[PDB]
Amino acid sequence: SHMFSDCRFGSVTYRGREYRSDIVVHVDGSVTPRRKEISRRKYGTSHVMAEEELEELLEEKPESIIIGSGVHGALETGFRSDATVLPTCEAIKRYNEERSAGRRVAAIIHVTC
Numbered sequence: 001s002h003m004f005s006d007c008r009f010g011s012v013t014y015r016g017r018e019y020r021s022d023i024v025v026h027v028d029g030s031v032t033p034r035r036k037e038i039s040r041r042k043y044g045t046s047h048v049m050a051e052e053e054l055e056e057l058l059e060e061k062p063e064s065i066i067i068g069s070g071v072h073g074a075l076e077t078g079f080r081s082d083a084t085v086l087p088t089c090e091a092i093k094r095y096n097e098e099r100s101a102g103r104r105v106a107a108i109i110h111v112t113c
């Protein structure tokens, strides 16, 4: 069962483990740290997400990419894509939805504003 089971400022729980930093959820259920440097190098801040951040996910050929824009959704997207951007606590619900339905879903979650 690859589900998020908790969302709150500064923290989300995925597959029984709490993450207090931004994370990338891969199609297979794996979790890796969000690569904030990609965006910091391109924009001078990681508050604007570079499309390059999605590049590692595009390889897994997901049917849907969900982006948790954070708690209070301050984080902004610097591109147009099929990816679904939603406030984090709304993003995890949507992820659980699709994952529950069996969809190849991947996500990038921002735990703060």
Ligand SMILES: [Cl-]
Pocket: 019, 021, 022, 023, 032, 033
């Ligand atoms: Cl982490």
Ligand SMILES: [Cl-]
Pocket: 036, 046, 047
């Ligand atoms: Cl950030």
